[PDB]
Design an enzyme around this catalytic site. Structure first.
Site, short mmCIF file in Angstrom:
data_model
loop_
_atom_site.label_atom_id
_atom_site.label_comp_id
_atom_site.label_asym_id
_atom_site.label_seq_id
_atom_site.Cartn_x
_atom_site.Cartn_y
_atom_site.Cartn_z
N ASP A 63 40.33 41.97 91.71
CA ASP A 63 38.94 41.84 91.27
C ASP A 63 38.65 40.37 90.96
O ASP A 63 38.32 40.02 89.83
CB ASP A 63 38.67 42.73 90.04
N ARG A 98 33.06 36.21 86.98
CA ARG A 98 33.18 36.94 85.71
C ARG A 98 34.63 36.96 85.20
O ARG A 98 34.84 36.92 83.99
CB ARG A 98 32.66 38.39 85.86
N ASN A 99 35.62 37.01 86.11
CA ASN A 99 37.03 37.06 85.72
C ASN A 99 37.70 35.68 85.74
O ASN A 99 38.92 35.61 85.82
CB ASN A 99 37.79 38.04 86.61
N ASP A 146 42.77 38.58 83.24
CA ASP A 146 43.04 39.99 83.56
C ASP A 146 43.74 40.18 84.91
O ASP A 146 43.42 41.12 85.63
CB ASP A 146 41.74 40.81 83.49
C1 LIG Z 1 35.88 43.07 76.36
C2 LIG Z 1 35.59 41.59 76.16
C3 LIG Z 1 35.00 40.92 77.38
O1 LIG Z 1 34.94 41.50 78.46
N1 LIG Z 1 34.50 39.68 77.24
C4 LIG Z 1 34.36 38.99 75.94
C5 LIG Z 1 34.36 37.50 76.35
N2 LIG Z 1 35.70 36.91 76.48
N3 LIG Z 1 36.80 37.69 76.77
C6 LIG Z 1 37.87 36.88 76.83
C7 LIG Z 1 39.17 37.41 77.03
C8 LIG Z 1 40.25 37.86 77.24
C9 LIG Z 1 41.57 38.38 77.45
C10 LIG Z 1 42.06 39.39 76.63
F1 LIG Z 1 41.42 39.69 75.49
C11 LIG Z 1 43.31 39.95 76.84
C12 LIG Z 1 43.95 39.65 78.03
C13 LIG Z 1 43.43 38.70 78.92
N4 LIG Z 1 44.33 38.53 79.97
C14 LIG Z 1 45.31 39.36 79.70
N5 LIG Z 1 45.28 39.82 78.41
C15 LIG Z 1 45.98 41.02 78.07
C16 LIG Z 1 46.39 41.22 76.65
C17 LIG Z 1 47.42 40.92 77.69
C18 LIG Z 1 42.22 38.06 78.64
F2 LIG Z 1 41.69 37.15 79.49
C19 LIG Z 1 37.49 35.60 76.40
C20 LIG Z 1 38.34 34.43 76.18
N6 LIG Z 1 39.65 34.61 76.36
O2 LIG Z 1 37.86 33.36 75.81
C21 LIG Z 1 36.10 35.64 76.19
N7 LIG Z 1 35.27 34.60 75.81
C22 LIG Z 1 33.83 34.74 75.55
C23 LIG Z 1 33.56 37.54 77.65
C24 LIG Z 1 34.09 38.79 78.35
C25 LIG Z 1 33.07 39.41 79.27
O3 LIG Z 1 31.93 39.75 78.50
C26 LIG Z 1 30.88 40.29 79.28
#
Ligand SMILES: *CCC(=O)N1C[C@@H](n2nc(C#Cc3c(F)cc4c(ncn4C4CC4)c3F)c(C(N)=O)c2NC)C[C@@H]1COC
Length: 284
Positions: A149, A153-154, A167
């Site tokens: 994916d 967005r990712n 992710d």
């Molecule tokens: C559900 C949250 C979500 O979709 N968001 C919130 C915002 N955002 N998310 C991230 C992140 C992350 C993250 C994670 F929490 C865990 C993870 C990741 N890779 C692997 N791991 C798993 C645990 C082992 C990962 F990237 C962030 C960051 N990191 O700054 C943000 N910033 C804002 C946006 C995103 C999408 O919202 C629509």
């Protein structure tokens, strides 16, 4: 939570202070946090990190999925252009998985915000984004990892404007439905992944082509207005997106190469890093 402790990754709960939920969607799963000692050079400094945690009412599968994703990140290893694992709190409380914090949000929002203003990005800055995403994907492909994916967005952007793929170790269900009906992942999917559920590093290359189109449209929605029904017909017929207005011919040929129906005819991520590297050198 009964889990094994990997000492080289275990962080003391006294070092972690949880903060505000990141993003409005899927709130509570990911929160911003501060961890003391994460930077080996400054042991006293609190470092802002992102913490993934389970919900109060989560299933045993939700827990195993989070542990498996964390364990797959340990196997894949670290690279500058991927979101990295920094630590975990697995003992004496709820499971918290620490990953690198990306202050400037996802690449699509980062680009849309910088369409106008002082923060407006240059052609070189947009090529730098493509090079960094290709570098991170080259590393993930080399570590036997398929994103499945790949989209703006990712891809998360740090305060230092570093691109980091997120992710990648996450296991995704192939299809919500033939037509998902959630009412968008299908626009980034390669034809073989979309019609035959076939995922390879070359199918991620097709997704990278759609991501490149996002970069030069500054967060544009691919195939805008076209329904999913018509999109399947268009891709089977050989129709592809038009060149973004502010995009060079040589870069659109890289996009057009990512969208070959035959996966092997698409370039490898090693070749995309090489193609985007020459684009950065020529500009001087
Ligand atoms: C559900 C949250 C979500 O979709 N968001 C919130 C915002 N955002 N998310 C991230 C992140 C992350 C993250 C994670 F929490 C865990 C993870 C990741 N890779 C692997 N791991 C798993 C645990 C082992 C990962 F990237 C962030 C960051 N990191 O700054 C943000 N910033 C804002 C946006 C995103 C999408 O919202 C629509």
């Amino acid at each position: 939570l009964e889990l094994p402790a990997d000492p080289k990754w275990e962080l003391s709960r006294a070092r972690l202070t949880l903060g505000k939920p990141l993003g409005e969607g899927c709130f509570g799963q990911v929160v911003m946090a501060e961890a003391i000692g994460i930077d080996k050079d400054r042991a006293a400094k609190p470092v802002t990190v992102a913490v993934k945690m389970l919900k109060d009412d989560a299933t045993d599968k939700d827990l195993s999925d989070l542990v498996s994703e964390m364990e797959m990140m340990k196997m894949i290893g670290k690279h500058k252009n991927i979101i990295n694992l920094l630590g975990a709190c697995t003992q004496g409380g709820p499971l918290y998985v620490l990953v690198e914090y990306a202050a400037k949000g996802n690449l699509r929002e980062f680009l849309r915000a910088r369409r106008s203003g002082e923060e407006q990005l240059t052609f070189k800055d947009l090529v730098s984004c493509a090079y960094q995403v290709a570098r991170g994907m080259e590393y993930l492909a080399s570590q036997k990892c398929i994103h499945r994916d790949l989209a703006a967005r990712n891809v998360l952007v740090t305060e230092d404007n570093v691109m980091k793929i997120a992710d990648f170790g996450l296991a995704r269900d192939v299809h919500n439905l033939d037509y998902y009906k959630k009412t968008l992942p299908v626009k980034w999917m390669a034809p073989e992944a979309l019609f035959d559920r076939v995922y390879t590093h070359q199918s991620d290359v097709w997704s990278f082509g759609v991501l490149l189109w996002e970069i030069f449209t500054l967060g544009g929605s691919p195939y805008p207005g076209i329904p999913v029904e018509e999109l399947f017909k268009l891709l089977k017929e050989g129709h592809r997106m038009d060149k973004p207005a502010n995009c060079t011919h040589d870069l659109y040929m890289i996009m057009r190469e990512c969208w070959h129906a035959a996966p092997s005819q698409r370039p490898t991520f090693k070749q995309l890093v090489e193609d985007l590297d020459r684009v950065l050198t020529v500009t001087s």
